[PDB]
Amino acid sequence: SPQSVRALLERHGLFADKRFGQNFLVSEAHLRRIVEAARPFTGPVFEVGPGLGALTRALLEAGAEVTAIEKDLRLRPVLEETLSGLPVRLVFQDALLYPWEEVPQGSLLVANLPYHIATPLVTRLLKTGRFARLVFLVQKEVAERMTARPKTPAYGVLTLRVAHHAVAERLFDLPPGAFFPPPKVWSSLVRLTPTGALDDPGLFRLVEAAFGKRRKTLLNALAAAGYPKARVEEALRALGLPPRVRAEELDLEAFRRLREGLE
Ligand SMILES: Nc1ncnc2c1ncn2[C@@H]1O[C@H](CO)[C@@H](O)[C@H]1O
């Protein structure tokens, strides 16, 4: 309950710290949903931000082999208490500094992610190609970006970054009350299933150029970013797109074809 979480924090003399984006998950039902979205545990599990150990314990109980990476050293006593008797590798480090590129092929990310590192962290883990599934909570707006369809406000670079590497599902929305202390926004449970592609720097130079100048048509954004105007005009024409088409109108395959057209 929010009651029990509040009481656990108080007993350990802890306060939720905004510098760590600390919002701890309350309900067993939400923990269950996260575990069920991530199972079966066919590879090692990495959890970023175990916090009070609620999800960590659920994972371990489900038979997962877990490495949990926590930046706040103050959470060590509560984590040791919650996880007493259970095989966990507890690592106290900034997860943005963890050697992600070397995790075993087939690893799973399962985590209530700290809002302020979620986007760069997920981007990096997707680039590794090492994960079978990534299952995590993120702010609802970030979830919407990760699962956007073309021609919408949320559609952009992050959408295309996730799509290039993976299929994306928004499985459930969680109200601020699902956490203690409650955040100011809703969160969502997201599942990413990598589909094989590693980074494609050329593709993302194009995508980032495409979305850099948001008030411009695709042609002008790309031209202003140093792509030869005539070649862009021709590639767009060749794809049967209107001269003044905008970046948000193109799906992943369309960007791939555009890139192939320009090269
Ligand atoms: N950079 C980070 N690496 C690992 N854990 C983090 C980081 N930033 C915040 N956390 C932890 O993530 C959890 C978010 O609820 C908290 O336990 C918080 O302390």
Curated annotation (Swiss-Prot):
CDD domains, alphabetized: AdoMet_MTases (cd02440)
EC number: 2.1.1.182
Transferase keyword on record: yes
Record's catalysed reaction(s): adenosine(1518)/adenosine(1519) in 16S rRNA + 4 S-adenosyl-L-methionine = N(6)-dimethyladenosine(1518)/N(6)-dimethyladenosine(1519) in 16S rRNA + 4 S-adenosyl-L-homocysteine + 4 H(+)
One Pfam family this sequence matches: RrnaAD
UniProt-listed InterPro entries: KsgA/Erm, rRNA_Ade_diMease-like_C, rRNA_Ade_Mease_Trfase_CS, rRNA_Ade_methylase_Trfase_N, rRNA_adenine_dimethylase, SAM-dependent_MTases_sf
Binding site for S-adenosyl-L-methionine: 23, 25, 49, 70, 94, 112
The keyword Acyltransferase appears for this protein: no
Main location: cytoplasm
Localisation: Cytoplasm
Listed GO MF terms: 16S rRNA (adenine(1518)-N(6)/adenine(1519)-N(6))-dimethyltransferase activity; RNA binding
Keyword line: Cytoplasm, Methyltransferase, RNA-binding, rRNA processing, S-adenosyl-L-methionine, Transferase
Uppermost EC category: transferase
Disulphide-bonded residues: none
Signal peptide, first to last residue: none
UniProt cross-references to SUPFAM superfamilies, sorted A to Z: S-adenosyl-L-methionine-dependent methyltransferases
Task performed by this protein: Specifically dimethylates two adjacent adenosines (A1518 and A1519) in the loop of a conserved hairpin near the 3'-end of 16S rRNA in the 30S particle. May play a critical role in biogenesis of 30S subunits.
Cross-referenced HAMAP family: 16SrRNA_methyltr_A (MF_00607)
UniProt similarity note: Belongs to the class I-like SAM-binding methyltransferase superfamily. rRNA adenine N(6)-methyltransferase family. RsmA subfamily.
Protein name: Ribosomal RNA small subunit methyltransferase A
Species, as recorded: Thermus thermophilus (strain ATCC 27634 / DSM 579 / HB8)
